[PDB]
Amino acid sequence: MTTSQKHRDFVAEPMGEKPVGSLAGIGEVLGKKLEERGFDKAYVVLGQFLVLKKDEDLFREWLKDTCGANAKQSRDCFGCLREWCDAFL
Amino acid sequence: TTSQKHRDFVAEPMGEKPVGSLAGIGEVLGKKLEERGFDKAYVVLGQFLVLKKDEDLFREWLKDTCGANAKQSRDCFGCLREWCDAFL
Structure with missing residues (x-):
């Protein structure tokens, strides 16, 4: 496992009303x-x-244009949402 | 009340379903x-x-984008709202 624990926590369950920083x-x-x-x-x-x-x-x-995310941050956020969708959408 | 199309949509993840679902x-x-x-x-x-x-x-x-009337937009909204309560 190469992902953060934080990614794994997010993709493990529906997101409900979680804040954006999750x-x-x-x-x-x-x-x-x-x-x-x-x-x-x-x-x-x-x-x-x-x-x-x-x-x-x-x-x-x-994401870069909206909050100034760098390449790693935008890759991590994309990958988290992509894997969440694969699990739950 | 609700259509069977509504219930079928809200019953499961939507995956790659077409917009017509x-x-x-x-x-x-x-x-x-x-x-x-x-x-x-x-x-x-x-x-x-x-x-x-x-x-x-x-x-x-939805009205602005595709011309949905009030019933159509009610139906579509309600199916997304109930899907989200079940799966999001």
Whole structure:
């Protein structure tokens, strides 16, 4: 297992009302910036991932533009949402 | 009350179901959703979630996007709301 424990916690169960900082890659700095843009709960970021048809390039670019995520952070967040979807959607 | 199409949708994960599997989304609406990129049910779920599950704004967006009338948008909203309560 190469993922963070944090990723594994997220993908292990439905996300319900979890905050955006429960997503892998989304530390407190990125999470504050996402919340200030209206992306307060993880499911709102899931929504964007889904409206972008789960496209890695568009989602990671959107995350960079919206909260300044770097490549590792956007990869981790994408991978967490992708694996969550594979398990639960 | 509810249609069987609604109950069938809310009973299980949606996976790669087409947009027409959503309650209220018939052939005409599905066509116009697909023309706009919303070809699978999960893409419309995505919009529902980005709008924070807000009934008024989601139903208005659906009317604006594909021409859904009030019953169609009611049906579609309700199926996504109940799916989310069961699976999200």
